[PDB]
């Protein structure tokens, strides 16, 4: 029972960190969108190469 309670807490931490990754993901989405809008594909992703 105590193991299952700790597993539920661990799963909740995993879920909130997954949403943290999704938030930082939307940050990257916006940032890549803006960068390509300044010049396509982060300046054609050569600087990404």
């Amino acid at each position: 029972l105590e193991r299952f309670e700790l597993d539920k807490r661990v799963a909740q931490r995993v879920k909130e960190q997954m949403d943290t990754n999704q938030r930082e993901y939307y940050l990257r989405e916006q940032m890549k969108a803006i960068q390509k809008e300044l010049g396509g594909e982060d300046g054609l992703s050569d600087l990404e190469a």
């Binding site: 010049g39 300046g43 054609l44 050569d46 600087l47």
Partner: protein, 50 residues
């Protein structure tokens, strides 16, 4: 090897020099702006991201 850079006073008709050698070599003479310009855009430029 060298391509034989000149040294002298600028006063001659060096344009006509390039033309008479471009005639003696059947070359299509051009002129540019490379000296006196202080920016790498007439000489190099930079990578095509700006």
């Amino acid at each position: 090897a060298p391509i034989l850079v000149l040294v002298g006073p600028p006063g001659v008709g060096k344009t006509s020099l390039g033309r008479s050698i471009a005639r003696s070599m059947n070359r299509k003479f051009h002129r540019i702006s490379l000296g006196g310009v202080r920016d790498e855009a007439e000489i190099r430029g930079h990578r095509r991201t700006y």
